Scaffold this motif. Structure first.
Motif, PDB file in Angstrom:
ATOM      1  N   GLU A  67       0.886  -1.145   0.016  1.00 21.14           N
ATOM      2  CA  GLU A  67      -0.121  -0.056  -0.029  1.00 21.14           C
ATOM      3  C   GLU A  67       0.631   1.268   0.062  1.00 21.14           C
ATOM      4  O   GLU A  67       2.022   1.088   0.607  1.00 21.14           O
ATOM      5  N   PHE A  68       0.485   2.234  -0.675  1.00 24.27           N
ATOM      6  CA  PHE A  68       1.202   3.442  -0.914  1.00 24.27           C
ATOM      7  C   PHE A  68       0.447   4.529  -0.448  1.00 24.27           C
ATOM      8  O   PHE A  68      -0.828   4.792  -0.235  1.00 24.27           O
ATOM      9  N   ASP A  69       0.996   5.816   0.035  1.00 28.47           N
ATOM     10  CA  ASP A  69       0.222   6.910   0.511  1.00 28.47           C
ATOM     11  C   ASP A  69      -0.206   7.820  -0.651  1.00 28.47           C
ATOM     12  O   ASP A  69       0.729   8.310  -1.584  1.00 28.47           O
ATOM     13  N   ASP A  70      -1.520   7.695  -0.864  1.00 28.81           N
ATOM     14  CA  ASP A  70      -2.048   8.314  -2.135  1.00 28.81           C
ATOM     15  C   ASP A  70      -3.192   9.508  -1.911  1.00 28.81           C
ATOM     16  O   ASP A  70      -3.915   9.980  -2.406  1.00 28.81           O
ATOM     17  N   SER A  71      -2.567  10.253  -0.616  1.00 35.99           N
ATOM     18  CA  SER A  71      -3.060  11.562  -0.105  1.00 35.99           C
ATOM     19  C   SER A  71      -2.567  12.710  -0.904  1.00 35.99           C
ATOM     20  O   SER A  71      -3.295  13.738  -0.827  1.00 35.99           O
ATOM     21  N   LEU A  88      -1.047   6.167  -7.960  1.00 35.62           N
ATOM     22  CA  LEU A  88      -0.742   4.779  -7.234  1.00 35.62           C
ATOM     23  C   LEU A  88      -1.401   4.508  -5.882  1.00 35.62           C
ATOM     24  O   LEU A  88      -1.084   5.429  -5.039  1.00 35.62           O
ATOM     25  N   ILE A  89      -2.185   3.605  -5.894  1.00 32.90           N
ATOM     26  CA  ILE A  89      -2.810   3.325  -4.374  1.00 32.90           C
ATOM     27  C   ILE A  89      -2.155   1.982  -3.670  1.00 32.90           C
ATOM     28  O   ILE A  89      -1.917   1.781  -2.733  1.00 32.90           O
ATOM     29  N   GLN A  90      -1.781   1.119  -4.689  1.00 34.84           N
ATOM     30  CA  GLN A  90      -1.212  -0.341  -4.064  1.00 34.84           C
ATOM     31  C   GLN A  90      -0.933  -1.192  -5.231  1.00 34.84           C
ATOM     32  O   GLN A  90      -1.247  -0.924  -6.565  1.00 34.84           O
TER      33      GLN A  90
HETATM   34 NA    NA Z   1      -4.261   4.170   0.990  1.00 30.50          NA
END
Ligand code: NA
Ligand SMILES: Cc1ccnc(S(N)(=O)=O)n1
Ligand SMILES: [Zn+2]
Length: 258
Positions: A67-71, A88-90
């Motif tokens: 999982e990635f920081d997609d903020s 990118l979200i995951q």
């Molecule tokens: Na996320």
């Protein structure tokens, strides 16, 4: 819902809870290399992962997600068939019990040992849950895995899997660079499709790279030691978590390359 990949709850059953399983733009599909047309209109593909922030890895009982920081726009996909910017979200994989199967997409009916999906959502919809309700809400970059030499950029992933063996386990997974998972070439096929697991929503622009990456037998063997079950439950190895090819119907697969 109690969907999975066994005889009793596998892809052939999904339609009973998710009727869109038999829809007009489902994924994955077979890519027939002699029917896909080179499209000179396709702009070049832009994979901008320099600022990617990985956070955590989760066994969700179906695969494992990094999982990635997609903020904010940290790691994005643009260009190719896409309008606008996709965050990118995951990423996750699908794989087999043996090297002869595991991929979701096929290439002239060829199945690869596994398939990587880097999932991105269209920032014009503000969040992922809104994006999946739109026909252009997601872009999934799919990358085939073949068994051969080891992939060094994968090893950090395989080394954490012992710590998330069972459904619901997660681990911290910071500072992982998903650029290490790409092949040399970004040549690709593209078509409109869906998520390949429930809810099967028809919201994906699929971008599937032509060039597989090579991973070692030892690396993929470690994927197959994961569990679909929770802690303390009888062991069901996490293998063959792939959906087979679906009807192409009224769709055209385009190639970025001649
Ligand atoms: Na996320
Ligand atoms: C996040 C998510 C849900 C379902 N399916 C997918 S997939 N396998 O089409 O990449 N991704
Ligand atoms: Zn997937």
């Amino acid at each position: 819902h109690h969907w999975g990949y066994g005889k009793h709850n596998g892809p052939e059953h999904w339609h009973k809870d998710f009727p869109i399983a038999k829809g007009e733009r489902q994924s994955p599909v077979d890519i027939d290399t002699h029917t896909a047309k080179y499209d000179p209109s396709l702009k070049p593909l832009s994979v901008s992962y320099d600022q990617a922030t990985s956070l955590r890895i989760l066994n969700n009982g179906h695969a494992f997600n990094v999982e990635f920081d997609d903020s904010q726009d940290k790691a994005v996909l643009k260009g190719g068939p896409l309008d606008g910017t996709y965050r990118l979200i995951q990423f996750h994989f699908h794989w087999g019990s043996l090297d002869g199967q595991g991929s979701e997409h096929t290439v002239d009916k060829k199945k690869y040992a596994a398939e990587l999906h880097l999932v991105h959502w269209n920032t014009k919809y503000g969040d992922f849950g809104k994006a999946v309700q739109q026909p252009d809400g997601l872009a999934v970059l799919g990358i085939f895995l073949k068994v051969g030499s080891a992939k060094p950029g994968l090893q950090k992933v395989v080394d954490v899997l012992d710590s998330i063996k069972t459904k619901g386990k997660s681990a911290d997974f910071t500072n992982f660079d998903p650029r290490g998972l790409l092949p040399e070439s970004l040549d690709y096929w593209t078509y409109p499709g869906s998520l390949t697991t429930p809810p099967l929503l028809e919201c994906v622009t699929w971008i599937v790279l032509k060039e597989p990456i090579s991973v070692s037998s030892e690396q993929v063997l470690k994927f197959r030691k994961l569990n679909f079950n929770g802690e303390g439950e009888p062991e069901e190895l996490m293998v063959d978590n792939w959906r087979p090819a679906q009807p192409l119907k009224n769709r055209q697969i385009k190639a970025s390359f001649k």
